[PDB]
Design a protein around this ligand. Structure first.
Ligand SMILES: CCCCCCCCCCC[C@H](O)CC(=O)SCCNC(=O)CCNC(=O)[C@H](O)C(C)(C)COP(=O)(O)O
Ligand code: SF4
Ligand code: SF4
Ligand code: SF4
Lengths: 115, 155, 115, 176, 209, 85
């Protein structure tokens, strides 16, 4: 364990006295929205791989310090904030459905260098 | 003599006009470094009676320093008009006096003299601090070569 | 082929609609800019100068280009009222200094060997 | 590796608060500024007595140009035209036509001071070290036209700042 | 380094960003037309105009990308292609110390939805492109002229606006103001046709037409 | 006192008379701006603006295009002003 973090070292980014539980509830939350997107999508094929992966590390080891090394995400507040925008990123591409092939192929000589 | 009294008065009127004139800047570009890098202790100019001071209503000579863009052109003209008479302008740097590097570009006027009546030209990219100090010295010597009251009396 | 993405217009109707209150905004703009910027040119002088600039952009027949002229058109009026521009900027359209370029064949022939 | 700057954790003991309270009540950090400034006052200045003495320079100093010449007086310029081929501001204009003794050397060498950048690319571009950056800098003029140099002006400065330039280029050709 | 002249090349970086390029490709293959790694180890993403918001948001919050530092946004205007304005962003990720380039294509008329939602850094990296190039980005807070004279016409950094421009300033006595006029040059900017008539690099040789 | 339609009729036709291009001759009760009087759509924006100063009123652009003759100008503003004399 450890005594409360006096300062996370990043202004604006405050402290959270409930590291593992807040990470977990946010983590099942992103598991929830992962359901609506189809499983066959490479999004869901890749997020659930890292979902079940580092949900185990937070669940197995409850200490703040050991979790920091295992996830290499600085302080927990950074990680949960990082996972927070992962939730928002999950919501945006829920409606986007970027799984069908290219919208349209590029023009013939649009790419390729030199001109 | 009639010419002698106007001669003594003319000297007294402009003897310190070349020693109490106080420079004015606009400090556009890298020439704005030597602008006040001369105000640094090494090439002291405060000793020469000159001392940098914006105060556009209460200054004598403006050292135009940097690249003169068209976008700023109104600002300089309104400053020079607000400038009291007598007034002199010094074009420091190749860009200020003649465009220099950017002479061919679209957003710089080719030389400051196209905008303001330009006195002694000090060249340099940038002019090494004493080169303007030499240029300022030339301006003060030019002040001596003046017959203001003499011309008035001749008329 | 003709498939292009909009910004503000679909049909010339709404395209001509945008230039309508663009004129309306500009029509009411003349009385204040001349007085507040302290000019010499008359109010109707400005109004027709606004007017003629419309006629220059009149031969285009593409809803796709007019709006680009509209946004360019709406990119100037606020620059005048909010004293962003200066006297050399707004009297510039009042093309005054330059000599009048000769128009007949002889006068162009006399001035120089250019078209 | 890194180190913090702001964090201080000022101790709240009776002795420490006394120093902080004393500092605020009877100003001490401000008097420190007075002590530092007064110590500055009792120190000889660094000002230089121009023009009676002028600050130091280097053998590589880049100033007013000059077209040099050989030991016998021949123009080193041959109008190879490399200098304006690298002149970043296109301040160099060169033309060449025949010279009387069968030669076809240059006629025009105008480096516009108001266009020039004094980067020194010209002297490095010259294969015969014809155009160089002279040591002089006191050539301020009151007419824009004066700074517009020509062939004769360049050659005259070459004959004026000759001994100095020759010594500098002799003291610097090993570096280049 | 047995060859001090050449820049030493690295392969562990080379394949890893190559793998990450595939990673982003699979995640959202709707917009990425193709991904190109570089010998300089600068992988680049080629996206579609409608794809600006998705990919930019994707690299911003994703747990394996975290690219949230907008380096720059600019245009590489290429007349020879129908989409002359080539809008390109540069992204930086502090967590995985990598730099991502996302490249689009656009005509003079087609818009691009503003990226201010992704990065508010673009706020001013958006204005100048509209000024310097003329391409207009939709739903942006402001499209003001930031790097030109007031009332300036055209777009300079295009390959159409000449170096000297069209208008020149000068202070005139009659009007008592610095007025404009068609440009006139004391010296014409001389031409330096310097591209050699001999092929330089067989590697980057253009395929025969 | 209210603002009658004969008032509306004259003052709508009054400032229409004041603007420089319109000649008194071709002006009539109908005096359609496009095919009777003869102007441009921007000039149509011009006159409706002149109506704004005459009345001290406001008209939207959604209905400014249909105001194709003084009769509609008279009828349209009388409709919203809710005065029918
Ligand atoms: C002194 C103040 C500063 C100095 C002055 C500053 C004046 C700025 C004016 C605004 C910007 C620009 O110059 C002029 C513009 O908006 S141009 C209209 C473009 N819109 C089009 O649709 C083009 C095709 N044209 C048509 O469709 C019709 O022909 C038309 C609409 C003209 C009606 O014609 P009629 O019928 O009425
Ligand atoms: S003359 Fe040289 S130093 Fe001075 S503004 Fe121009 S480029 Fe900069
Ligand atoms: S100065 Fe040197 S480089 Fe320039 S034209 Fe003469 S010989 Fe050639
Ligand atoms: S020093 Fe001046 S003349 Fe020589 S190459 Fe540089 S800009 Fe041109």
């Amino acid at each position: 364990a450890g005594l409360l973090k006096k300062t996370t070292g990043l202004v604006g980014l405050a402290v959270c006295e409930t590291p593992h539980e807040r990470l977990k509830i946010l983590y099942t939350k992103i598991l929830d929205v992962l359901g609506q997107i189809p499983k066959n999508a490479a999004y869901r094929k890749y997020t659930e791989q890292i979902t079940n992966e580092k949900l185990g590390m937070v669940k197995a080891e409850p200490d703040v310090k050991k979790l920091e090394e295992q996830l290499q995400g600085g302080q927990i507040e950074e990680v949960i904030l990082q996972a927070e925008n992962e939730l928002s990123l999950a919501r945006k591409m829920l409606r986007w459905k970027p799984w069908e092939p290219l919208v349209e192929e590029p023009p013939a000589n649009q790419w390729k260098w030199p001109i | 003599r009639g010419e002698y009294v106007v001669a003594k008065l003319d000297d007294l009127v402009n003897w310190a006009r070349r020693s109490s004139l106080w420079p004015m800047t606009f400090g556009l570009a890298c020439c704005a470094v030597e602008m006040m890098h001369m105000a640094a202790p090494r090439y002291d100019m405060d000793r020469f009676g000159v001392v940098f001071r914006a105060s556009p209503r209460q200054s004598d000579v403006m050292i135009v320093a940097g690249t003169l863009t068209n976008k700023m052109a109104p600002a300089l003209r309104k400053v020079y008009d607000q400038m009291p008479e007598p007034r002199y302008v010094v074009s420091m740097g190749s860009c200020a006096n003649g465009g220099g590097y950017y002479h061919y570009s679209y957003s710089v006027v080719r030389g400051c003299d196209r905008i303001v009546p330009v006195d002694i030209y000090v060249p340099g990219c940038p002019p090494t601090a004493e080169a303007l100090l030499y240029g300022i010295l030339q301006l003060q010597r030019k002040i001596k070569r003046e017959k203001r009251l003499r011309i008035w009396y001749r008329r | 082929g003709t498939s292009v993405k909009p910004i503000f217009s679909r049909d010339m109707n709404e395209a001509k609609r945008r230039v309508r209150e663009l004129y309306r905004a500009w029509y009411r703009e003349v009385p204040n800019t001349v007085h507040l910027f302290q000019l010499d040119i008359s109010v109707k002088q400005g109004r027709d100068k606004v007017r003629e600039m419309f006629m220059k952009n009149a031969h285009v027949t593409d809803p796709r280009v007019v709006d680009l002229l509209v946004i360019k058109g709406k990119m100037e009026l606020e620059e005048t009222i909010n004293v962003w521009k200066q006297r050399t900027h707004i009297m510039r359209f009042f093309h005054e200094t330059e000599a009048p370029r000769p128009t007949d064949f002889l006068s162009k022939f006399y001035v120089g060997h250019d078209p | 590796t890194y180190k913090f700057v702001n964090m201080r954790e000022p101790s709240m003991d009776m002795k420490s608060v006394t120093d902080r309270a004393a500092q605020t009540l009877l100003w001490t950090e401000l008097v420190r500024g007075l002590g530092m400034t007064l110590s500055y006052l009792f120190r000889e200045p660094a000002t230089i007595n121009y023009p009676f003495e002028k600050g130091p320079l280097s053998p590589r100093f880049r100033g007013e140009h000059a077209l040099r010449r050989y030991p016998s007086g021949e123009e080193r310029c041959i109008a190879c035209k490399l200098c304006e081929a690298v002149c970043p501001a296109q301040a160099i204009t060169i033309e060449a036509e025949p010279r009387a003794d069968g030669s076809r050397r240059t006629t025009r060498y105008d480096i516009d001071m108001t266009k020039c950048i004094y980067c020194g690319f010209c002297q490095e571009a010259c294969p015969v070290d014809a155009i160089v950056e002279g040591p002089n800098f006191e050539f301020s003029t009151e007419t824009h036209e004066e700074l517009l140099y020509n062939k004769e002006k360049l050659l005259n400065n070459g004959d004026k700042w000759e001994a100095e330039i020759a010594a500098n280029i002799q003291a610097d050709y090993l570096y280049r | 380094d047995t060859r001090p002249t050449i820049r030493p090349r690295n392969d562990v970086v080379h394949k890893q960003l190559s793998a990450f390029g595939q990673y982003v490709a699979e995640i959202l293959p709707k917009y990425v037309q193709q991904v190109q790694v570089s010998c300089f180890n600068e992988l680049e993403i080629f996206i579609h105009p409608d794809g600006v918001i998705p990919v930019l948001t994707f690299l911003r919050d994703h747990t394996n990308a975290q690219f949230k530092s907008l380096a720059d946004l600019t245009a590489v205007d290429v007349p020879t292609r129908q989409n002359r304005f080539e809008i390109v962003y540069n992204l930086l990720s502090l967590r995985f110390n990598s730099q991502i380039r996302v490249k689009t294509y656009t005509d003079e008329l087609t818009p691009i939805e503003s990226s201010v939602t992704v990065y508010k850094a673009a706020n001013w990296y958006e204005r100048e492109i509209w000024d310097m190039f003329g391409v207009f980005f939709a739903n942006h807070p402001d499209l003001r002229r930031i790097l030109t004279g007031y009332g300036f016409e055209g777009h300079p950094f295009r390959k159409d606006f000449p170096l000297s421009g069209y208008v020149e300033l000068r202070y005139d006595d009659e009007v008592k103001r610095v007025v404009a006029e068609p440009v006139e040059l004391a010296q014409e900017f001389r031409k330096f046709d310097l591209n050699s008539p001999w092929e330089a690099f067989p590697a980057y040789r253009q395929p025969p037409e | 006192p209210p603002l009658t339609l004969e008032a509306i009729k004259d003052r709508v036709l009054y400032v229409l008379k004041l603007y420089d291009k319109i000649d008194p001759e071709k002006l009539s009760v109908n005096s359609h701006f496009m095919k009777d009087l003869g102007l441009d759509s921007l000039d149509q924006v011009e006159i409706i603006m002149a109506m704004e100063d005459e009345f001290g009123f406001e008209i939207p652009d959604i209905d400014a295009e249909k105001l194709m003759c003084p009769q509609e100008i008279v009828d349209y503003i009388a409709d919203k002003k809710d005065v029918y004399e």
